């Protein structure tokens, strides 16, 4: 039928999507800025559609409840028909691929470790062999599922500890994880994606560090409901943007160009 405005679900997560200074004076898409805002604009341009950015209601990436088998987060928006497309740092995973489509990845990352500087930890190994320094992950996302599902010894041991720790080591948002690392005098380390880790490492007060190698290797993709007519074009747009070097530029713009911890 006639062209319709495309509903883009996304998540407030720096530096992917952030409230512009003066957002209280702005409306619609103008309220926001960031890597995924820029990406959304480029994708819409290359696929020839109009769109409306909408922050996911429950503020989550997406997990399926093991009881009700209901999906929440951005994945839920797509599965239940609330949004037409998701443009966010949304990790490509098997369980998600089974219910939604993903474009080829637009960004690579791996699970990694964030510490307050000087913390005596340099690996997942180290974390698992001690109990003084607590550690956890984001709720309702791909990192928690990674530990829950892992059959690798060190990671299995970390999960056994995490899932029962008290008080809870899990946080509802990345910002909550960061604050907890920053305020815990070295007694909390945070497991998050290297992209977010690296972004925070360049933010004031420059008191956090990525340590160790990545625990795994994967990517973010743009998601659409299964069998959506947008999928193909969006995949091509991502490949074109990648090959033009636009994704590389966008990353430097939002991570490094105006980093706050020196050159």
Ligand X SMILES: N[C@@H](CCC(=O)O)C(=O)O
Ligand Y SMILES: C[C@@H](CNS(C)(=O)=O)c1ccc(-c2ccc([C@@H](C)CNS(C)(=O)=O)cc2)cc1
100 closest CA partner among 70, 80, 126: 80
C-beta atoms surrounding 207 within 10 Å: 16
For ligand Y, the closer CB: 165 or 236: 236
Contact call for residue 15 and ligand X (CB under 6 A): no
- What sign for the dihedral angle of Cα 119, 172, 83, 94? positive
Residue 98 touches which member of Cl ion, a second copy, ligand Y, none, C-beta under 5-8 Å by kind: a second copy
Number of residues near ligand Y (by CB under 6 A): 12
Residue 261 touches which member of ligand X, Cl ion, ligand Y, none, C-beta under 5-8 Å by kind: none
**In which residue are the tokens 């990352």 written?**
109
Q: Which stretch binds ligand Y (CB under 6 A): 34-42, 120-128, 194-202, 239-247?
A: 239-247
Contact call for residue 90 and ligand X (CB under 6 A): yes
Tell me how far CA of residue 96 lies from CA of 31, 58, 63, 222, in angstroms: 29, 18, 9, 12
193 is in an annotated binding site: yes
Tell me how far CA of residue 78 lies from CA of 10, 15, 63, 106, 123, in angstroms: 11, 23, 12, 19, 36
Residue 94 touches which member of a second copy, ligand X, Cl ion, none, C-beta under 5-8 Å by kind: a second copy
How far is 82 from 106, CA to CA, in rounded Å? Answer: 23
First vs last Cα of the chain: how many Å apart?
Answer: 52
Interface residue list for ligand X (CB under 6 A): 61, 89-91, 138, 141-143, 192-193
Give binding residues as ranges.
89, 91, 96, 142-143, 193
Binding residues for L-glutamate: 89, 91, 96, 142-143, 193
Interaction site with a second copy (CB under 8 A) = 92-94, 97-98, 102, 104-105, 108, 146, 149-152, 216-219, 221, 235-236, 239-240, 242-245, 247-248
């Amino acid at each position: 039928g006639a062209n319709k405005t495309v509903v883009v679900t996304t998540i407030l997560e720096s530096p992917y999507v952030m409230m512009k200074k003066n957002h209280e004076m702005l409306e619609g898409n103008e309220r926001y800025e960031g890597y995924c805002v820029d990406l959304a604009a480029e994708i819409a341009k290359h696929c020839g559609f109009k769109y409306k950015l909408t922050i996911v209601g429950d503020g989550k990436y997406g997990a399926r409840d093991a009881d009700t088998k209901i999906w929440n987060g951005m994945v839920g928006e797509l599965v239940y028909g609330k949004a037409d497309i998701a443009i966010a740092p949304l990790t490509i995973t098997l369980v998600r691929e089974e219910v939604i489509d993903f474009s080829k990845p637009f960004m690579s990352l791996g699970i990694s470790i964030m510490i307050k500087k000087g913390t005596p930890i340099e690996s997942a190994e180290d974390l698992s062999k001690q109990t003084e320094i607590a550690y956890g992950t984001l709720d309702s996302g791909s990192t928690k599922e990674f530990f829950r599902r892992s059959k690798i010894a060190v990671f299995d041991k970390m999960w056994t500890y995490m899932r029962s720790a008290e008080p809870s080591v899990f946080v509802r948002t990345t910002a909550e994880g960061v604050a907890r690392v920053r305020k815990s005098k070295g007694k909390y380390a945070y497991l998050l994606e290297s992209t977010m880790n690296e972004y925070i490492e360049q933010r004031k007060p420059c008191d956090t560090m990525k340590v160790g190698g990545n625990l795994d290797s994967k990517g973010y993709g743009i998601a659409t409901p299964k069998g959506s007519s947008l999928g193909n074009a969006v995949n091509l747009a991502v490949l074109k943007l990648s090959e033009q070097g636009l994704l590389d530029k966008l990353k430097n713009k939002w991570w490094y160009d105006k980093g706050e911890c020196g050159s």
